[PDB]
Amino acid sequence: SEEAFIYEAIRTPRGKQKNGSLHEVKPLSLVVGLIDELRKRHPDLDENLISDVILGCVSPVGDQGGDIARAAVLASGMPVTSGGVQLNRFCASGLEAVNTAAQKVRSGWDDLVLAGGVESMSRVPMGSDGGAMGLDPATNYDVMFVPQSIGADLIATIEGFSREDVDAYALRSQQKAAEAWSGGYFAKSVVPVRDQNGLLILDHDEHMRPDTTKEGLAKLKPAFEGLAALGGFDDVALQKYHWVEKINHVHTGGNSSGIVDGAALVMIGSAAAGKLQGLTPRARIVATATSGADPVIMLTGPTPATRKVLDRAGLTVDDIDLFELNEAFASVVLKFQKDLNIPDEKLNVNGGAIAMGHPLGATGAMILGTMVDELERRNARRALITLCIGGGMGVATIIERV
Amino acid sequence: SEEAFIYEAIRTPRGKQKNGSLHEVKPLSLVVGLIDELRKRHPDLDENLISDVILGCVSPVGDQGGDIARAAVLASGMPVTSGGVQLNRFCASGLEAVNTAAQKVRSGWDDLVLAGGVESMSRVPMGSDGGAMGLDPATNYDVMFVPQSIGADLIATIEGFSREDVDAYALRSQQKAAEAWSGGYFAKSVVPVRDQNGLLILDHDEHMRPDTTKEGLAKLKPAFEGLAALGGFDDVALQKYHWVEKINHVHTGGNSSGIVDGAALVMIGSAAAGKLQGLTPRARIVATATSGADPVIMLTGPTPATRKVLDRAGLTVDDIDLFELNEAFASVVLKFQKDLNIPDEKLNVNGGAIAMGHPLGATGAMILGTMVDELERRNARRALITLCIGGGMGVATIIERV
Amino acid sequence: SSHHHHHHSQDPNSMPDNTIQWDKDADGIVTLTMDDPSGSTNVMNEAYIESMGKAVDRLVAEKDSITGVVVASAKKTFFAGGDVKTMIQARPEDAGDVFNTVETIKRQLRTLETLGKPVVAAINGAALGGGLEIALACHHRIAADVKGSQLGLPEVTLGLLPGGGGVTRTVRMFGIQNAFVSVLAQGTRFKPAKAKEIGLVDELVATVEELVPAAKAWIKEELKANPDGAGVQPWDKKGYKMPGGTPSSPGLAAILPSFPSNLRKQLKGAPMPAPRAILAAAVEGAQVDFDTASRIESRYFASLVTGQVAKNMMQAFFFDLQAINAGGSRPEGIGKTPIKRIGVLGAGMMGAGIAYVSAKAGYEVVLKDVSLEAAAKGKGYSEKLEAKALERGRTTQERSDALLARITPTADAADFKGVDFVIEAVFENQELKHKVFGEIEDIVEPNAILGSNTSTLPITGLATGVKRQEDFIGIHFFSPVDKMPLVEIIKGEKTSDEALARVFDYTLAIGKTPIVVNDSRGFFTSRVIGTFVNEALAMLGEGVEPASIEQAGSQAGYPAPPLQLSDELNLELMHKIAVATRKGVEDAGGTYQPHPAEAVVEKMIELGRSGRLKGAGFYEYADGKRSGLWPGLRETFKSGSSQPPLQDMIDRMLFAEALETQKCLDEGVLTSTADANIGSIMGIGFPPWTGGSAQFIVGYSGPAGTGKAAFVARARELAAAYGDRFLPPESLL
Numbered sequence A, B: 001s002e003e004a005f006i007y008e009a010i011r012t013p014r015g016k017q018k019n020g021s022l023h024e025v026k027p028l029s030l031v032v033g034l035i036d037e038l039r040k041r042h043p044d045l046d047e048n049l050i051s052d053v054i055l056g057c058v059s060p061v062g063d064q065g066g067d068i069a070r071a072a073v074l075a076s077g078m079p080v081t082s083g084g085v086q087l088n089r090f091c092a093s094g095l096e097a098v099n100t101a102a103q104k105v106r107s108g109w110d111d112l113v114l115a116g117g118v119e120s121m122s123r124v125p126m127g128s129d130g131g132a133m134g135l136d137p138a139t140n141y142d143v144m145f146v147p148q149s150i151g152a153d154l155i156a157t158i159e160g161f162s163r164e165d166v167d168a169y170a171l172r173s174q175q176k177a178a179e180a181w182s183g184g185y186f187a188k189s190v191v192p193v194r195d196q197n198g199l200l201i202l203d204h205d206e207h208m209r210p211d212t213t214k215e216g217l218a219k220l221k222p223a224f225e226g227l228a229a230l231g232g233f234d235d236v237a238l239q240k241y242h243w244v245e246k247i248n249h250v251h252t253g254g255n256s257s258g259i260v261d262g263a264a265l266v267m268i269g270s271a272a273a274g275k276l277q278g279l280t281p282r283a284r285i286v287a288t289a290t291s292g293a294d295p296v297i298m299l300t301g302p303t304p305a306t307r308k309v310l311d312r313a314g315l316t317v318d319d320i321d322l323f324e325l326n327e328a329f330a331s332v333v334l335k336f337q338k339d340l341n342i343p344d345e346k347l348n349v350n351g352g353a354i355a356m357g358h359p360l361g362a363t364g365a366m367i368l369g370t371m372v373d374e375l376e377r378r379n380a381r382r383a384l385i386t387l388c389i390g391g392g393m394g395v396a397t398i399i400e401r402v
Numbered sequence C: 001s002s003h004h005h006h007h008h009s010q011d012p013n014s015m016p017d018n019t020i021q022w023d024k025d026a027d028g029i030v031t032l033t034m035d036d037p038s039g040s041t042n043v044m045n046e047a048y049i050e051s052m053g054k055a056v057d058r059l060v061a062e063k064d065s066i067t068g069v070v071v072a073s074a075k076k077t078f079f080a081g082g083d084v085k086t087m088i089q090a091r092p093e094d095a096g097d098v099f100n101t102v103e104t105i106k107r108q109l110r111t112l113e114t115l116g117k118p119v120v121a122a123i124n125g126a127a128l129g130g131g132l133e134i135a136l137a138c139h140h141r142i143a144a145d146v147k148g149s150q151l152g153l154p155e156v157t158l159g160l161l162p163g164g165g166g167v168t169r170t171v172r173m174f175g176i177q178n179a180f181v182s183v184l185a186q187g188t189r190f191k192p193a194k195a196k197e198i199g200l201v202d203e204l205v206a207t208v209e210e211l212v213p214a215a216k217a218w219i220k221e222e223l224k225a226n227p228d229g230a231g232v233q234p235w236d237k238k239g240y241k242m243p244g245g246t247p248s249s250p251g252l253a254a255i256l257p258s259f260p261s262n263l264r265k266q267l268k269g270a271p272m273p274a275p276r277a278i279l280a281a282a283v284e285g286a287q288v289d290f291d292t293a294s295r296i297e298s299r300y301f302a303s304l305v306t307g308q309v310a311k312n313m314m315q316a317f318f319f320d321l322q323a324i325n326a327g328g329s330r331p332e333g334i335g336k337t338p339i340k341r342i343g344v345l346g347a348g349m350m351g352a353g354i355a356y357v358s359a360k361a362g363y364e365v366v367l368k369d370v371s372l373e374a375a376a377k378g379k380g381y382s383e384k385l386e387a388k389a390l391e392r393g394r395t396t397q398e399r400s401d402a403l404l405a406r407i408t409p410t411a412d413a414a415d416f417k418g419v420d421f422v423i424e425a426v427f428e429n430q431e432l433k434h435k436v437f438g439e440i441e442d443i444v445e446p447n448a449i450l451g452s453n454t455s456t457l458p459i460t461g462l463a464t465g466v467k468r469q470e471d472f473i474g475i476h477f478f479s480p481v482d483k484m485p486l487v488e489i490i491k492g493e494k495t496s497d498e499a500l501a502r503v504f505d506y507t508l509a510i511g512k513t514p515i516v517v518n519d520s521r522g523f524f525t526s527r528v529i530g531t532f533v534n535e536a537l538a539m540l541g542e543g544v545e546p547a548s549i550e551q552a553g554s555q556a557g558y559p560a561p562p563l564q565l566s567d568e569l570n571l572e573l574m575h576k577i578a579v580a581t582r583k584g585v586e587d588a589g590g591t592y593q594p595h596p597a598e599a600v601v602e603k604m605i606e607l608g609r610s611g612r613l614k615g616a617g618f619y620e621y622a623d624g625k626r627s628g629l630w631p632g633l634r635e636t637f638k639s640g641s642s643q644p645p646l647q648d649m650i651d652r653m654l655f656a657e658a659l660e661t662q663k664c665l666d667e668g669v670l671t672s673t674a675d676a677n678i679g680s681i682m683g684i685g686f687p688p689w690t691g692g693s694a695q696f697i698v699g700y701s702g703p704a705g706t707g708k709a710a711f712v713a714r715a716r717e718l719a720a721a722y723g724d725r726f727l728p729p730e731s732l733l
């Protein structure tokens, strides 16, 4: 029954896709910077006690190929025994890294593990790595491949979320992200990015539009660029959800997650490993779970995964103080809130990826660290973190403040 | 806490790189074929109890991009809740997938997991994914990047292994592989690849050269196929190992691992999961470990990892009946044997990658299942499986026959 | 956004002068003529940046009436270099200002380049560094094939990189590999003909008067023939494809990991950061758009300018070298004395090399030896060098035959008639040189310079064998003379100031760099290089692996490892010097403190391995080439029993020479640190990244700190661990 604790949880600011501040910064550099910040916080940490470095990364090609986790271990000059493994479970990679790190600590065969993710989407765009489910016609034709936005629009159609409904959520996310930054909530967790000369590159989340109005959101066109712009995917979706006549395309760039660059790091160890290194535990990993739902609608995996992690930890919704669901698309959060009857004042209380962006491999570890701080800032007890995943998967984690 | 058991461990035959029988076979199809073999062996198994599918893959790009583990779940019609994650810890990805699946079961938050790997090196060559440690000159210039072959030659130079020494091991691997195939040892674990029509594609390890002779190996020229032919790496290695004057290039295509295509699957679960699904445990995961050594010599990671997995299991070399180390290079095995005084009759007793090939992401799960089958055949008790890895890493596992 | 340094009000008396003249013809072609009134050379300084800012602003404001632009110069050169006096002062805290300055420079060139109109560079003379970068921003380059004109990006030779777009644009034009190897990594300078061949220049003209007209002619034709693509660089067109591919190209991605390893192999692991930074900027920039790539280039530039190595190299290869070439050590108030006929005594590797560089500079040389057979084989040294230069195309069959024709081999002393400059290169023996000079001093002219190429023997003693000691002087060359750039001029106690100037002027004529050294035991070069090899031989005696010793020498930045160099110096001559030094000490009434290397020398003498000249030293010599380290070396000295850290080995060699240089400065052997720095770099091969063995002290950088105080701390560290010879002199305390 080895218990797993979170000792540090940090992240870079999120640079935007068009004329972004992080476009000149290699993703490896984003991870090394966060390793150097952990050193600044614990200069007498025995890095030899760090036994693995697990990084989530959805497009491990180019700047992100070749086991970027191992590259961060070597480029930062960490001990060669610290390992380094990249994993890809689509949008949950960051949280799957953290959960895998927790499970390794619980097993008793790893003591102190670094976990997180990195995604420089302006340099390595989504889909760069290819893949059978999209690029092999036999498999594409069978699994009924459909981009996520179309599943999200379909969720809005089936559930009755209007264009104004998803826009009302987008506005709320912008307002709560602005309030959290202005309130200093992110001061100690967002680590500014600097060049080799020490000059500043980025110290805030560029994608935010804190002057968002409900009238400007209504002026936006449903204009996804890429696979969604090509034809057929609407018909493929309705061939499965055949009781639906037409898909209402409610999602735009203003109520969908932002394409951004970023990285996040989380330090996880046992009580003995933390006490041996003068570390103060911040939170405890209570339970993790994985489940999933149909891959055509895709983004409904959170509800069985959240259900499973609650029954695994012996808890219910009323036992949870904060719910943090990644804002991939507004309809997914509204669907999740409706199904579990999540009170509004507990849901994504500091804003989410609609305002600040969704750096695929890293997002799960960013919103994980976001709840560690918000539990401490409110002196709240429990937080539940979950993300939808491409292909119909879901990951959930429950943390407890210590 | 929870003990983790191996219930099934199967693999495809390894098709060779040039005019190979598996070149026409998508790497996704190699995995799905193994999933279908598991169904054939256990028709009434409730696949909903399978919570994750963890595939190692070193070049997750192209036919192997887009989370091939999730593609395998959907394409094979497995339950959509079974997840699917790809990971890359270079050469140990296959065994790291099994070790991660074992650690997931020990934590108590997973019941039944499929683990293994896939690598179609004739379709997705090593290096296709890029990477910083090779293609970013700032990182490369500082970590002193060197390809694996030169580390192996450097090991032979230091430890004093001659060209006849490493060729003598290569002949031993070819002999023991041919003896294992002729004796029927691989009859029930190598699953022949068949096409959409059931026609045979491959049913043996076609990289084997059983008529190998000492004279034939002596005629081979040192390695010159990839990064090794390009200049500089010899000087870079000697800038690190400044007491060595000249590197003795003893490794050739005949005493190095073969570039091949293959896949492997391992079913790992708790005692309750097997009792519920009517599965008989074949072996038990006693301990896993990870360590490392210098990244320039690179391939000497197995010695500390084996020492740590023995200490963790409270065992010594004398308590291990079978040693299975991957035959990346002959000098790596000879160094491992010399440093721990491993008896010759306990080391890679059924041949290795020199004879049968080293399908990067799948190798760890192939040589693991090889030991499960040999412990049963010999009625022996304990086996130790370990692989050197690129960058200076190392992974070891101890299994006990059940 | 802005093309100017400041966007706030400054002191009006701080406004820089105007360096760019504006002229617009009736056809709408604007000619920008750079004419900095503060010097003879257009240089990239505060005045240029403000001047180009105003001009580029006016180009944009008047874009309706402007059809094309011509960038010309009014000086003898086109545009040469940057403001080194300002760059060398950039502290690490000034990295923000450095970044902003080069960003502003490139913002001007980017606007010029994307004007929608053709821009032509009329390159009339040298276009070096920032000058070529200005030209590369133009759409077409025309150079005037004229004597002295050079083109290139030599920023790496001062520890910098081309921060005004030179990296980004050459990579966009030639691709990563060719730009780095051919242009960037070594800062190669090209004559206009070669510049056109590789693509640095597009056209040539015979004289400068044709340039501006040819430029306007090309603007007229380009607008007529290619109106859609006029004023559009290849990289600003849809469908641009980088030559050799981008990093994501499968072909270039295959060989790309070998680029840093081949660099480490070329640099031998020396700590020279500039080439690494150029390679990083080159590759990283080829992954992103032009503007992003340009900003990455600025960050690496600021990383080098604020670093210590660039300061060491700017101090040595700019300031120190200019002071030497300006006659800092040449005595004042001395006139010129042209040289008619040179007489070289000795046809060995030294004397044959002296004859080659003397005849290459246009002098008639009489090459005398003991026999005509030997003197003929001496001229064969020049024949073999010319033959190897003809098959490479660096000289004409006409100029080569005229070179060899100036070398007259002889064995007769009477053929030294009419010689006004003697350079003796015979064996190291005092009474021999006394004899050899006595047999020619009457045959040569009365005002002839009597020079001796010696490595060890004092000049004042050698002068007692001639009548006119006022004209006897030491002219120390370095083997191989055709490739070694220093001449150590040694002033004996009776040597006149006129003789110093004539050899000084001779050294510049043959294309070499002179230093002036007072007569002393070992002078400067020999004495200092001795502390280098002796430090390595002592390491061998202590039991350090020979391979580690040679790596430490190579990774310190020396051109040759110390054991290899010892074989070429001949251990027997090292012993003779040690015996000489002990003799002078023990006869003056004192006690001699032997260097621990003297025991290693004697052990090699006893084993019959005195160096390369007798076929065996620390290395095995087969087929005239060198063939690995002697395998018996490890058992003779118990190699491996002592395993000091590599940096200690490196530092012991560097510090031994730095400390010895300070002694030479204290004793008066040298009169200026400029001579000490260039003398160590060009004479004995002290690593260029240090800026010289004197700059090494004031610019030292280690894990303990920076500067003279950190040098002393580290010297005291080495002294406590390896011997009192590493204790610093009082001059440093």
Ligand SMILES: O=S(=O)(O)c1ccc(-c2ccccc2)cc1
Pocket (backbone or CB within 6 Å): A090, A091, A133, A143, A144, A145, A146, A147, A148, A295, A296, A298, A389, A390, A391, A392, B074
């Ligand atoms: O998260 S994405 O990588 O954008 C992703 C997008 C789409 C899918 C998918 C959709 C339908 C059937 C099977 C797979 C999987 C992943």
Ligand SMILES: O=S(=O)(O)c1ccc(-c2ccccc2)cc1
Pocket (backbone or CB within 6 Å): A074, B090, B091, B133, B143, B144, B145, B146, B147, B148, B295, B296, B298, B389, B390, B391, B392
């Ligand atoms: O197993 S490979 O992917 O071929 C691989 C090869 C080489 C390296 C590496 C070597 C030295 C310094 C840093 C990295 C890492 C992995």
Ligand SMILES: O=S(=O)(O)c1ccc(-c2ccccc2)cc1
Pocket (backbone or CB within 6 Å): C005, C006, C008, C009, C010, C011, C012, C013, C014, C015, C016, C046, C050
């Ligand atoms: O306030 S102004 O008179 O407009 C003014 C503006 C700028 C400058 C200046 C520009 C470059 C280098 C140094 C000084 C000088 C005066």
Ligand SMILES: O=S(=O)(O)c1ccc(-c2ccccc2)cc1
Pocket (backbone or CB within 6 Å): C044, C045, C046, C049, C081, C082, C083, C084, C086, C087, C101, C102, C105, C129, C130, C133, C155, C160, C161, C162, C163, C164, C165
């Ligand atoms: O490396 S160069 O591009 O040749 C370069 C050289 C010099 C300068 C500069 C120096 C001082 C004041 C203003 C500019 C800037 C760039």
Ligand SMILES: O=S(=O)(O)c1ccc(-c2ccccc2)cc1
Pocket (backbone or CB within 6 Å): C086, C087, C088, C089, C090, C091, C094, C097, C098, C101, C102, C305
């Ligand atoms: O802060 S200052 O010392 O005034 C300073 C500022 C800038 C520079 C510089 C500018 C361009 C290229 C290289 C150096 C040099 C010195």
Ligand SMILES: O=S(=O)(O)c1ccc(-c2ccccc2)cc1
Pocket (backbone or CB within 6 Å): C455, C456, C457, C458, C520, C521, C522, C526, C527, C528, C530, C577, C580, C581, C584
């Ligand atoms: O004139 S002597 O005193 O015989 C004498 C002359 C020169 C040297 C010497 C030579 C090279 C390097 C260091 C010292 C030593 C002694």
Ligand SMILES: O=S(=O)(O)c1ccc(-c2ccccc2)cc1
Pocket (backbone or CB within 6 Å): C455, C522, C525, C526, C527, C529, C530, C531, C533, C569, C573, C574, C577
């Ligand atoms: O100028 S050289 O002839 O190259 C030369 C330079 C230095 C030495 C030497 C001086 C003292 C101790 C050992 C060797 C000998 C010869």
Ligand SMILES: O=S(=O)(O)c1ccc(-c2ccccc2)cc1
Pocket (backbone or CB within 6 Å): C483, C484, C485, C559, C681, C682, C683, C684, C685, C686
């Ligand atoms: O590039 S130069 O500055 O002309 C230069 C040329 C040559 C040398 C040198 C080479 C070998 C042994 C000692 C010195 C040093 C500097």
